[PDB]
Amino acid sequence: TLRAAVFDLDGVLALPAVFGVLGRTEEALALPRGLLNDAFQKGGPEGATTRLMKGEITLSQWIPLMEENCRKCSETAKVCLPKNFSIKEIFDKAISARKINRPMLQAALMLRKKGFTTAILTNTWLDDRAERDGLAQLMCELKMHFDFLIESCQVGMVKPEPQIYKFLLDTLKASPSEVVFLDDIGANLKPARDLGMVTILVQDTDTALKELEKVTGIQLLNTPAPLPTSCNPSDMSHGYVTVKPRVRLHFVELGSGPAVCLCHGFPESWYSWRYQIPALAQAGYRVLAMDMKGYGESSAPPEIEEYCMEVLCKEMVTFLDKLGLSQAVFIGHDWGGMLVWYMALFYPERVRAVASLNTPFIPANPNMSPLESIKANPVFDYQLYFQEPGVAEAELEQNLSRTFKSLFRASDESVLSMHKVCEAGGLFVNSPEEPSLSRMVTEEEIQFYVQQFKKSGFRGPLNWYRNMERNWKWACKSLGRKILIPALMVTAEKDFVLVPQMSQHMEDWIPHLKRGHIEDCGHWTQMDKPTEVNQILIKWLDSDAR
Amino acid sequence: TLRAAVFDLDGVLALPAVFGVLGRTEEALALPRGLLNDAFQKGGPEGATTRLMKGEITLSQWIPLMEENCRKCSETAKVCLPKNFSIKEIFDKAISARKINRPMLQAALMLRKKGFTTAILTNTWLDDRAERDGLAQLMCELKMHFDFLIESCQVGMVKPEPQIYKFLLDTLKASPSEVVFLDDIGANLKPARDLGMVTILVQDTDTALKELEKVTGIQLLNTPAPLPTSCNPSDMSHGYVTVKPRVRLHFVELGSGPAVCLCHGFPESWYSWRYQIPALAQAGYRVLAMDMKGYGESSAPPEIEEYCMEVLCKEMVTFLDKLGLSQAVFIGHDWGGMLVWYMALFYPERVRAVASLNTPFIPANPNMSPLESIKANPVFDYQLYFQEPGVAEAELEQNLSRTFKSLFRASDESVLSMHKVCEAGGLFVNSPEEPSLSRMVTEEEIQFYVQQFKKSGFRGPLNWYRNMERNWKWACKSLGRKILIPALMVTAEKDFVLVPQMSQHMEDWIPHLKRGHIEDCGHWTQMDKPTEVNQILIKWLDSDAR
Ligand SMILES: O=C1CC2(CCN(C(=O)N[C@H]3C[C@@H]3c3ccccc3)CC2)Oc2ccccc21
Ligand SMILES: O=C1CC2(CCN(C(=O)N[C@H]3C[C@@H]3c3ccccc3)CC2)Oc2ccccc21
């Protein structure tokens, strides 16, 4: 009975195989067949390549020894290599061309999701080339998805020597019978097979995957589109910045490149961006996913005035000051989307670009109180219910698992009837005590929100709604301005609070505004449609945010 | 009696004054005198410029209104502007040319060091230009050094209106008599003077500074070279990454750009890099200053084997994995310098560049035990004293303030006689119980090290010395390799433990090695000679580390 899958890197998890370029170069340069592949394997277990693969020498030290072997091979074949032939040039191009074999990774991911232990076992080198980062990035992306990565140059052993296989089994803590081994080189397959392991010879991916699903009994081929990679909270880098004596802001940080500051809504967390964090970092950005003031590990002072937009925005500027960031791209959802439009209006020098999910940019009406304005739209009735301090806190804090299970649901799962909220008494008055689990979330993900909200509750979050008058007066100071920095507005078809039509007049204040639209998407945009949010944001980031 | 100094930005803290380019453009383009400076002040308190300065409109909205005012001004002067005249082009160049007035900042710094409250009061705009980051960076660098920054476009008030001055005094919590105000525009000086504040009209810096030191009674002109900016621990972004179930690594983070990982020695802290952190972040790098395993807020497991180079290096790779960094430049001092040479030897794909302060790269002798090797040099006697678990811990933990005060001293302050350490009984046997304070450190800085070491003590740090045999066997696997990635070796003339001559054979293993040398520098390189460490590292980073 299988419980472990082992994959090679070259020709298995990554394609085209780096080995296959020696023959490609022979064909392209009309050189004698197997001339370059011979120079590569020259000396066998005593040769330069074995020393490279065992880690005795680096790739830059091996390049000249390979060049010498190419010369000795041509002496016997009675031929001559071209004028400006470069081994470095051949391997630089081959390594760059080698990309992840996405369906093979999906299979490894699915096997791991079903309880399998996974490992990458590879014959590799210590890369000190000036262009080594490309390979480093590839290894980083691949390795995170596996329980183990066994590199020949690190363990000083190599395939097909039988010691690396007993090493593999020892790291796996499993008998050969429980292990599937996939490899493109038959010689490297042999020792795993003659030990009792199930083996697959990888030529084309599809057949290899047909063989893999037959032996495991798990569907891996033609399977549905998987969700983007998520975040395990304990595996993240957690950051803490004191913005003022009583206020500390917490954030999760992943990646390198331009800073992208993610701002959640009500009643959320940095974790609401769980599907965007690995994706945006992988796309070449430095992600800073906030716990907004009043949430999670960030400070939650009790004062209402602490949550007005002016102070929230000033504190986000201090956050940038203290981290040494002259700018960041600001991406917000819901109440975070509103903060993000104000960051752009009041601090354009600190905002590289601005994006909002669901939240439109609507200027303040100087001829109407925000209380009158909110009473004009019956969908915003619950906001009046959120005004009185202690009232909504009591209902929202009564049963946390019920609060999030009732709130976080797709457009076709609506359990909340948000009309006549104050008249009916509360938010969950006609709601079940034990709500069903939404298709958008696991019980584990609900319990993370539950655990986060156990620290400060709903006072701080609800205070974001309690500065309507302060925010209105502040917003009025920006009525003569326009948003002229790069901006993105993303609408969600089935958000019944933040309807797409509420964003229709935005190009009057943001003429260069770019847009995105998500069909069959409710209010909880990030977890409802993660693949498309990622697609929209990465495309806009790469085009407008450097 | 003065206790507050207020400075303008343009023409005072930053030069050349952006205002002075309107006249420069007139002269360069042979336009009628005061044509462009007139178009700038058109309408007075009702004009486009006042609306810009009060924050009613942004710089990008103002550019076309200024262009229109330039046309109306030429109609009266009976002239015509050139073919491709651009207001944007003029202001883009003017803003870029404007740099910090370093002697004026030094004066503000010195006044603040002597107990003065400092503030920048400026007539500025909301910058939404595509090149706004240059100004954002300038403001970021300047503002950190002051108690307050009052921007006209943020407060909706302007100079010379008297309300901004009463606003200034209210923020300062001081009567006019206690306030010096420096400005290049006499009209903007007038309200501060007619309120009772001391005023200085800034033309040339030197005279302005002569006036400033006369009125304050503090020497500001011709004063010695100040120390680089340091770090206040509570103002830093603190990061925490779990590398394995029982191990969490702490780091301080500042800046944007390529990642620079700083690795301290024994018995130190992330704080040992206090003078490098603001400088390297200001030079365009993302600084990650570590608390190495066993120190400060990082985990300190008790097991000796937890501190062998192989595990320390593997954990630093995990640290990169978890932060989403494919590479970082690794800069180490002392034991950190040793880790940094091993990172380069075993993980070249994860090291952008490698630099070491004091620690040479010396390959393992396979024909000699590390115990024999250490006995060959009498300067390394204390290492034998560090071997027995509990012995050195007891002496080093007995009185923490005494430990750091005795250790952290310049070459001309030596209080420790490191020969016959084990024979004499201990490290501090012929040392004073109450050591004097070294010129390198304040009592406050000693107490930070004291407070950090109160958490885990010296067991973890001392364990770094307790794996000589494990490290030797591991190091022997790299004997066939060379360091071919960019490398820097920085020697300190008066380091008597890590003598410059110990680094003489390094180009045999690192042929492309670059060097730096610091004269009259002891072992504690970073705090002994901060200005030169910074100069050497920034120069090498900009040339070899992208
Ligand atoms: O000034 C703002 C901010 C605002 C942010 C989003 N918002 C909100 O209540 N979020 C609900 C979905 C959450 C929820 C959670 C639980 C219960 C009910 C609702 C309304 C206010 O949207 C605006 C839209 C237009 C103009 C201004 C604004
Ligand atoms: O493998 C290594 C690492 C090493 C790091 C620095 N080091 C050390 O003891 N630091 C003392 C100044 C600290 C101190 C503090 C308190 C008391 C005494 C000393 C000796 C060992 O330097 C090497 C040099 C050459 C080769 C290998 C190595």
Side-chain angles (χ1 to χ4, degrees):
Chain A
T1 180
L2 304 161
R3 58 172 271 269
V6 178
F7 306 79
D8 187 22
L9 181 95
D10 202 62
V12 177
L13 280 168
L15 293 166
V18 161
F19 242 117
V21 315
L22 294 144
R24 227 97 51 92
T25 320
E26 276 160 20
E27 267 195 3
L29 298 174
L31 293 161
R33 291 201 179 269
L35 200 274
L36 301 190
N37 257 298
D38 225 339
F40 197 84
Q41 64 92 66
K42 187 124 182 187
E46 291 82 29
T49 305
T50 296
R51 292 194 67 215
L52 171 76
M53 298 296 157
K54 278 173 157 173
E56 299 172 33
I57 55 159
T58 73
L59 191 64
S60 295
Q61 287 181 290
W62 173 96
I63 303 293
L65 315 170
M66 164 57 45
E67 244 142 26
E68 167 67 339
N69 288 339
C70 276
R71 198 243 211 93
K72 287 176 285 183
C73 275
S74 64
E75 278 187 291
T76 330
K78 285 216 267 163
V79 285
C80 248
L81 292 152
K83 225 133 124 168
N84 230 237
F85 176 80
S86 182
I87 285 299
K88 174 94 199 308
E89 234 113 63
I90 299 152
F91 288 91
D92 281 336
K93 207 186 264 81
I95 291 149
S96 189
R98 192 183 52 178
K99 308 255 253 178
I100 289 177
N101 181 5
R102 305 285 165 177
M104 191 65 81
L105 178 60
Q106 197 189 100
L109 251 8
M110 186 75 258
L111 293 175
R112 208 181 180 220
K113 209 180 115 185
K114 299 298 229 288
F116 268 65
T117 298
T118 54
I120 304 165
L121 172 56
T122 174
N123 275 22
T124 198
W125 56 82
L126 294 167
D127 207 332
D128 54 346
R129 289 181 300 126
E131 35 293 291
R132 70 197 174 274
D133 190 42
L135 170 125
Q137 283 178 234
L138 191 134
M139 293 316 293
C140 278
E141 190 183 1
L142 259 175
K143 79 192 258 185
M144 75 175 72
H145 299 301
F146 297 82
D147 295 286
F148 307 103
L149 164 58
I150 302 153
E151 291 171 295
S152 68
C153 57
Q154 282 282 292
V155 301
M157 288 174 267
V158 98
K159 290 187 302 179
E161 305 173 344
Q163 52 191 23
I164 199 155
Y165 303 85
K166 297 271 193 171
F167 180 79
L168 170 77
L169 292 160
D170 186 72
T171 72
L172 288 169
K173 294 153 100 176
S175 59
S177 170
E178 296 174 304
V179 181
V180 214
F181 191 104
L182 300 90
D183 202 317
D184 60 324
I185 299 170
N188 299 332
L189 234 3
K190 277 145 62 68
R193 203 179 2 261
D194 87 78
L195 247 82
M197 283 177 237
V198 173
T199 50
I200 292 153
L201 178 71
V202 180
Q203 270 174 51
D204 67 295
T205 299
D206 253 80
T207 307
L209 291 188
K210 284 163 207 157
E211 282 191 47
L212 186 57
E213 67 179 351
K214 203 147 274 177
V215 74
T216 59
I218 293 155
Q219 201 165 276
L220 303 157
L221 206 63
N222 321 312
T223 243
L227 284 176
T229 313
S230 186
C231 295
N232 174 193
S234 65
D235 301 344
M236 313 306 292
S237 180
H238 290 262
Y240 308 84
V241 181
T242 296
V243 293
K244 58 170 165 267
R246 295 223 72 189
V247 199
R248 164 193 97 162
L249 299 175
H250 166 254
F251 66 101
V252 149
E253 196 174 31
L254 190 75
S256 63
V260 179
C261 186
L262 305 181
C263 304
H264 66 77
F266 176 93
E268 312 183 53
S269 165
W270 69 261
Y271 198 61
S272 284
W273 300 103
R274 68 197 170 273
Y275 296 109
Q276 285 69 58
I277 306 150
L280 302 198
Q282 201 52 56
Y285 298 91
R286 177 185 174 180
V287 186
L288 305 138
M290 312 296 302
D291 261 337
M292 299 305 288
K293 189 184 189 166
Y295 293 91
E297 306 180 58
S298 288
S299 300
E303 298 86 12
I304 280 163
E305 337 90 68
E306 278 297 286
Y307 303 85
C308 77
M309 278 292 161
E310 188 176 10
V311 352
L312 293 171
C313 286
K314 209 271 142 292
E315 280 176 5
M316 282 310 295
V317 170
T318 306
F319 177 80
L320 290 188
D321 294 340
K322 303 214 185 174
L323 259 159
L325 305 174
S326 62
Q327 295 187 320
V329 3
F330 280 90
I331 307 179
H333 171 253
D334 185 73
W335 268 108
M338 191 75 261
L339 175 135
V340 127
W341 293 123
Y342 287 125
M343 285 300 292
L345 272 172
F346 288 82
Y347 301 104
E349 45 278 285
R350 301 285 225 142
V351 185
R352 217 288 99 208
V354 58
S356 176
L357 308 189
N358 311 41
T359 316
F361 172 66
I362 304 166
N365 186 343
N367 305 310
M368 197 162 282
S369 292
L371 230 169
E372 291 187 274
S373 309
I374 238 76
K375 280 215 181 80
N377 198 355
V379 309
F380 299 138
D381 177 74
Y382 66 89
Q383 298 190 26
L384 305 154
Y385 170 66
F386 287 177
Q387 297 307 294
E388 186 55 17
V391 186
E393 285 98 323
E395 193 197 10
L396 295 161
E397 287 158 27
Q398 181 64 43
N399 184 359
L400 294 165
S401 186
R402 190 203 179 190
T403 289
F404 301 103
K405 277 182 170 218
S406 304
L407 290 172
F408 306 159
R409 30 187 69 247
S411 54
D412 64 289
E413 296 181 316
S414 41
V415 105
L416 295 175
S417 46
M418 257 164 300
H419 54 13
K420 291 103 188 241
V421 160
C422 235
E423 181 183 77
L427 249 303
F428 320 125
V429 294
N430 305 281
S431 262
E433 256 295 327
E434 289 184 352
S436 59
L437 187 69
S438 161
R439 49 99 148 154
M440 291 203 308
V441 286
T442 64
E443 176 66 30
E444 285 69 49
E445 290 170 342
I446 286 291
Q447 300 306 310
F448 179 83
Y449 287 89
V450 164
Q451 289 318 295
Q452 295 296 296
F453 281 79
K454 266 178 189 183
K455 182 191 176 189
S456 326
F458 285 77
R459 199 216 244 256
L462 286 154
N463 282 348
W464 282 67
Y465 290 92
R466 305 176 173 151
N467 293 272
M468 299 309 188
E469 208 94 56
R470 256 176 217 101
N471 294 350
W472 175 75
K473 288 177 190 174
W474 190 60
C476 284
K477 297 163 180 72
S478 73
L479 289 171
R481 303 172 204 164
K482 281 193 174 194
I483 291 163
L484 302 156
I485 68 162
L488 179 70
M489 176 71 218
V490 184
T491 48
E493 197 210 336
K494 292 167 185 177
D495 185 337
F496 305 126
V497 169
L498 304 173
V499 307
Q501 84 185 95
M502 274 168 66
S503 82
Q504 78 192 328
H505 309 304
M506 282 176 67
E507 24 281 285
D508 294 336
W509 323 109
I510 320 160
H512 318 292
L513 179 73
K514 293 204 181 180
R515 290 173 178 269
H517 183 71
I518 322 190
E519 277 174 282
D520 198 30
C521 186
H523 175 75
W524 317 97
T525 313
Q526 307 100 296
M527 52 177 126
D528 197 324
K529 293 286 169 272
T531 310
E532 28 281 290
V533 165
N534 293 1
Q535 181 272 304
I536 290 167
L537 298 176
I538 289 155
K539 172 191 168 254
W540 170 76
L541 279 171
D542 291 340
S543 70
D544 294 67
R546 232 102 287 105
Chain B
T1 180
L2 304 161
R3 58 172 271 269
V6 178
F7 306 79
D8 187 22
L9 181 95
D10 202 62
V12 177
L13 280 168
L15 293 166
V18 161
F19 242 117
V21 315
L22 294 144
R24 227 97 51 92
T25 320
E26 276 160 20
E27 267 195 3
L29 298 174
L31 293 161
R33 291 201 179 269
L35 200 274
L36 301 190
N37 257 298
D38 225 339
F40 197 84
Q41 64 92 66
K42 187 124 182 187
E46 291 82 29
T49 305
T50 296
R51 292 194 67 215
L52 171 76
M53 298 296 157
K54 278 173 157 173
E56 299 172 33
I57 55 159
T58 73
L59 191 64
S60 295
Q61 287 181 290
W62 173 96
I63 303 293
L65 315 170
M66 164 57 45
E67 244 142 26
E68 167 67 339
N69 288 339
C70 276
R71 198 243 211 93
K72 287 176 285 183
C73 275
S74 64
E75 278 187 291
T76 330
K78 284 216 267 163
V79 285
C80 248
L81 292 152
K83 225 133 124 168
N84 230 237
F85 176 80
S86 182
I87 285 299
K88 174 94 199 308
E89 234 113 63
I90 299 152
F91 288 91
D92 281 336
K93 207 186 264 81
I95 291 149
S96 189
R98 192 183 52 178
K99 308 255 253 178
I100 289 177
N101 181 5
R102 305 285 165 177
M104 191 65 81
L105 178 60
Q106 197 189 100
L109 251 8
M110 186 75 258
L111 293 175
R112 208 181 180 220
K113 209 180 115 185
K114 299 298 229 288
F116 268 65
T117 298
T118 54
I120 304 165
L121 172 56
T122 174
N123 275 22
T124 198
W125 56 82
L126 294 167
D127 207 332
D128 54 346
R129 289 181 300 126
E131 35 293 291
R132 70 197 174 274
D133 190 42
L135 170 125
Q137 283 178 234
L138 191 134
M139 293 316 293
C140 278
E141 190 183 1
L142 259 175
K143 79 192 258 185
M144 75 175 72
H145 299 301
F146 297 83
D147 295 286
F148 307 103
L149 164 58
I150 302 153
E151 291 171 295
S152 68
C153 57
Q154 282 282 292
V155 301
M157 288 174 266
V158 98
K159 290 187 302 179
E161 305 173 344
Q163 52 191 23
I164 199 155
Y165 303 85
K166 297 271 193 171
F167 180 79
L168 170 77
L169 292 160
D170 186 72
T171 72
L172 288 169
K173 294 153 100 176
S175 59
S177 170
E178 296 174 304
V179 181
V180 214
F181 191 104
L182 300 90
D183 202 317
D184 60 324
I185 299 170
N188 299 332
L189 234 3
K190 277 145 62 68
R193 203 179 2 261
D194 87 78
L195 247 82
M197 283 177 237
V198 173
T199 50
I200 292 153
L201 178 71
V202 180
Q203 270 174 51
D204 67 295
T205 299
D206 253 80
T207 307
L209 291 188
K210 284 163 207 157
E211 282 191 47
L212 186 57
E213 67 179 351
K214 203 147 274 177
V215 74
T216 59
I218 293 155
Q219 201 165 276
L220 303 157
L221 206 63
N222 321 312
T223 243
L227 284 176
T229 313
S230 186
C231 295
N232 174 193
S234 65
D235 301 344
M236 313 306 292
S237 180
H238 290 262
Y240 308 84
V241 181
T242 296
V243 293
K244 58 170 165 267
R246 295 223 72 189
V247 199
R248 164 193 97 162
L249 299 175
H250 166 254
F251 66 101
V252 149
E253 196 174 31
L254 190 75
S256 63
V260 179
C261 186
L262 305 181
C263 304
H264 66 77
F266 176 93
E268 312 183 53
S269 165
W270 69 261
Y271 198 61
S272 284
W273 300 103
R274 68 197 170 273
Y275 296 109
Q276 285 69 58
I277 306 150
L280 302 198
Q282 201 52 56
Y285 298 91
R286 177 185 174 180
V287 186
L288 305 138
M290 312 296 302
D291 261 337
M292 299 305 288
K293 189 184 189 166
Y295 293 91
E297 306 180 58
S298 288
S299 300
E303 298 86 12
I304 280 163
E305 337 90 68
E306 278 297 286
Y307 303 85
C308 77
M309 278 292 161
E310 188 176 10
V311 352
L312 293 171
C313 286
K314 209 271 142 292
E315 280 176 5
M316 282 310 295
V317 170
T318 306
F319 177 80
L320 290 188
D321 294 340
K322 303 214 185 174
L323 259 159
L325 305 174
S326 62
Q327 295 187 320
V329 3
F330 280 90
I331 307 179
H333 171 253
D334 185 73
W335 268 108
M338 191 75 261
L339 175 135
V340 127
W341 293 123
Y342 287 125
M343 285 300 292
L345 272 172
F346 288 82
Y347 301 104
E349 45 278 285
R350 301 285 225 142
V351 185
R352 217 288 99 208
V354 58
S356 176
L357 308 189
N358 311 41
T359 316
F361 172 66
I362 304 166
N365 186 343
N367 305 310
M368 197 162 282
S369 292
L371 230 169
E372 291 187 274
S373 309
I374 238 76
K375 280 215 181 80
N377 198 355
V379 309
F380 299 137
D381 177 74
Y382 66 89
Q383 298 190 26
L384 305 154
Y385 170 65
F386 287 177
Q387 297 307 294
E388 186 55 17
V391 186
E393 285 98 323
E395 193 197 10
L396 295 161
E397 287 158 27
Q398 181 64 43
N399 184 359
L400 294 165
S401 186
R402 190 203 179 190
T403 289
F404 301 103
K405 278 182 170 218
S406 304
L407 290 172
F408 306 159
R409 30 187 69 247
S411 54
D412 64 289
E413 296 181 316
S414 41
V415 105
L416 295 175
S417 46
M418 257 164 300
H419 54 13
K420 291 103 188 241
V421 160
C422 235
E423 181 183 77
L427 249 303
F428 320 125
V429 294
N430 305 281
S431 262
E433 256 295 327
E434 289 184 352
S436 59
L437 187 69
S438 161
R439 49 99 148 154
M440 291 203 308
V441 286
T442 64
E443 176 66 30
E444 285 69 49
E445 290 170 342
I446 286 291
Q447 300 306 310
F448 179 83
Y449 287 89
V450 164
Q451 289 318 295
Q452 295 296 296
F453 281 79
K454 266 178 189 183
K455 182 191 176 189
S456 326
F458 285 77
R459 199 216 244 256
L462 286 154
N463 282 348
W464 282 67
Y465 290 92
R466 305 176 173 151
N467 293 272
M468 299 309 188
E469 208 94 56
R470 256 176 217 101
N471 294 350
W472 175 75
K473 288 177 190 174
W474 190 60
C476 284
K477 297 163 180 72
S478 73
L479 289 171
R481 303 172 204 164
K482 281 193 174 194
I483 291 163
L484 302 156
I485 68 162
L488 179 70
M489 176 71 218
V490 184
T491 48
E493 197 210 336
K494 292 167 185 177
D495 185 337
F496 305 126
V497 169
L498 304 173
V499 307
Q501 84 185 95
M502 274 168 66
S503 82
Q504 78 192 328
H505 309 304
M506 282 176 67
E507 24 280 285
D508 294 336
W509 323 109
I510 320 160
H512 318 292
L513 179 73
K514 293 204 181 180
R515 290 173 178 269
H517 183 71
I518 322 190
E519 277 174 282
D520 198 30
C521 186
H523 175 75
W524 317 97
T525 313
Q526 307 100 296
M527 52 177 126
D528 197 324
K529 293 286 169 272
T531 310
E532 28 281 290
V533 165
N534 293 1
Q535 181 272 304
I536 290 167
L537 298 176
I538 289 155
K539 172 191 168 254
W540 170 76
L541 279 171
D542 291 340
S543 70
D544 294 67
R546 232 102 287 105

